[PDB]
Design a protein around this ligand. Structure first.
Ligand SMILES: OC[C@@]1(O)OC[C@@H](O)[C@@H](O)[C@@H]1O
Ligand SMILES: OC[C@@]1(O)OC[C@@H](O)[C@@H](O)[C@@H]1O
Length: 90
């Protein structure tokens, strides 16, 4: 019933991203040190997890969005959210 969240952060400022699954939709709130704002991520799902890593100064984010038994990976690599190659054990 309650919304479900996932969070990641990078750097020392820091940057933070919080993903919320609410009524089948996952949205994103962002912090880079100057206030919270709404990010570009919008994808369907009831459950969400996230991980991220830096390559130098560039952030890479992977969001795992689940509905039923299907998990979709979404990828941020600097230029829009793209569907990743992740598949389950099937
Ligand atoms: O600067 C904000 C932004 O580009 O940061 C990287 C990702 O979190 C995006 O969804 C988000 O819109
Ligand atoms: O560049 C995207 C990608 O190759 O990044 C590593 C993994 O997240 C993969 O599933 C994904 O397709």
């Amino acid at each position: 019933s309650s919304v479900q969240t996932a969070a990641t952060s990078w750097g020392t400022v820091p940057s933070i991203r919080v993903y919320t699954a609410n009524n089948g939709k996952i949205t994103e709130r962002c912090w880079d040190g100057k206030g919270w704002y709404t990010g570009a991520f919008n994808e369907p799902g009831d459950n969400v997890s996230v991980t991220s890593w830096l390559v130098g100064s560039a952030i890479h984010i992977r969001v795992y969005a689940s509905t039923g038994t299907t998990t979709t990976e979404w990828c941020w690599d600097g230029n829009g959210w793209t569907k990743g190659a992740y598949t389950a054990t099937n």
